[PDB]
Amino acid sequence: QALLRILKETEFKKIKVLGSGAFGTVYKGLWIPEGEKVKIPVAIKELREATSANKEILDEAYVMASVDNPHVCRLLGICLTSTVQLIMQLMPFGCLLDYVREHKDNIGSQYLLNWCVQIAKGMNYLEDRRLVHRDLAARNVLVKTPQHVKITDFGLAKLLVPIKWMALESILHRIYTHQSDVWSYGVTVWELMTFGSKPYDGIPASEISSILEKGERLPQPPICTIDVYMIMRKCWMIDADSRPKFRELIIEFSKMARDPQRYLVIQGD
């Protein structure tokens, strides 16, 4: 339990709002641990107040605090009052979804393929721990530096619907496995390769199941060669066991990262 710090209310201060939504509020703030001589920049995520067991909350937070990988965000500390407040390291460049949209003209093939490797490394770490993420998406990848991204919000779903990132078996039967995480990974890569386009844009969530049942899939991004699109398509196979494994995705995307211009055709790159 020494991985999870229980923070007093005086030990952290919210300074600036970073974002707000149905989940709650995320702040940029300071962590001032008592009996220490340092003030640490952190993000503070205050979940929306709920009418619903503390023992199971701490137990899940202990798991979130136990993740130890350069490409998965760790839970630094927690503060339980009428609300749940999660403290973690501040990722100054924000979410990868906003980043690829803001830098669509200045992102080369090497950055994109390196991100695919790092996301697959983080997800493979979780699979080795027998942990399922359930909400992998570009909005849930954070940018520590342009060459270092981390998967965020692990365990938050269990602590508490992204239809367009979900595998068909998850939509129809609410089944979540590592192989359904692979489907979400495929959609995430598609978000990256389109510089942040919305998947199935304008299509209501209730229609997605019938799109997948008919055999339709997200279209090939303009910059993607057929080798990269084949990986995305394999992530979206109906048979979950036929999808790639995260360990295989690391190998194949690391191979492409060694000659990135061969696999992504980007103007000016």
Ligand X SMILES: *CCC(=O)N[C@@H]1CN(c2nc(Nc3cn(C)nc3OC)c3ncn(C)c3n2)C[C@H]1F
Q: Is 100 in the site for ligand X (CB under 6 A)?
A: no
Q: Is 192 in the site for ligand X (CB under 6 A)?
A: no
Name the minimum Å distance from CB 77 to ligand X: 13
Q: Is 243 in the site for ligand X (CB under 6 A)?
A: no
Q: Is 28 in the site for ligand X (CB under 6 A)?
A: yes
Q: Which residues pair with 13 in a beta bridge?
A: 30
Name the minimum Å distance from CB 140 to ligand X: 7
Q: Is 88 in the site for ligand X (CB under 6 A)?
A: yes
Q: Is 139 in the site for ligand X (CB under 6 A)?
A: yes
Catalytic residue among 135, 181, 227, 241: 135
Q: Which residues pair with 142 in a beta bridge?
A: 95, 150
Residue nearest to ligand X (CB): 19
Q: Is 162 in the site for ligand X (CB under 6 A)?
A: no
**Closer to ligand X at the Cβ: 133 or 139?**
139
What's the CA gap between 185 and 120, in Å, rounded? Answer: 8
Name the minimum Å distance from CB 263 to ligand X: 26
Residue 7 φ/ψ, nearest 5 degrees: -95, 135
**Closer to ligand X at the Cβ: 18 or 211?**
18
Burial readout 29-50 (b: 16 or more C-beta within 10 A, e: otherwise): bbbbeeeeeeeeebbbbbeeee
Determine the interface stretch with ligand X among 32-40, 93-101, 108-116, 260-268 (rule: CB under 6 A): 93-101
Q: Is 260 in the site for ligand X (CB under 6 A)?
A: no
Q: Which of 236, 256, 130 is nearest to 183 (CA)?
A: 236
Residue 132 φ/ψ, nearest 5 degrees: -105, 135
Q: Which amino acid is at 23?
A: F
Q: Is 142 in the site for ligand X (CB under 6 A)?
A: yes
Cβ burial, residue 201 (10 Å; 0-12/13-18/19+): exposed
**Closer to ligand X at the Cβ: 101 or 234?**
101
Q: Is 91 in the site for ligand X (CB under 6 A)?
A: yes
Q: Is 95 in the site for ligand X (CB under 6 A)?
A: yes
Q: Is 110 in the site for ligand X (CB under 6 A)?
A: no
Residue 135 annotated as catalytic: yes
**Closer to ligand X at the Cβ: 92 or 222?**
92
Which listed residue (67, 76, 97, 257) binds ligand X by CB under 6 A? 97
Which listed residue (3, 5, 13, 18) binds ligand X by CB under 6 A? 18
Q: Which of 110, 104, 97, 99 is nearest to 189 (CA)?
A: 97
List residues binding ligand X (CB under 6 A). 18-19, 26, 28, 43, 45, 88, 90-92, 94-95, 97-98, 139, 142, 152
Catalytic residues: 135
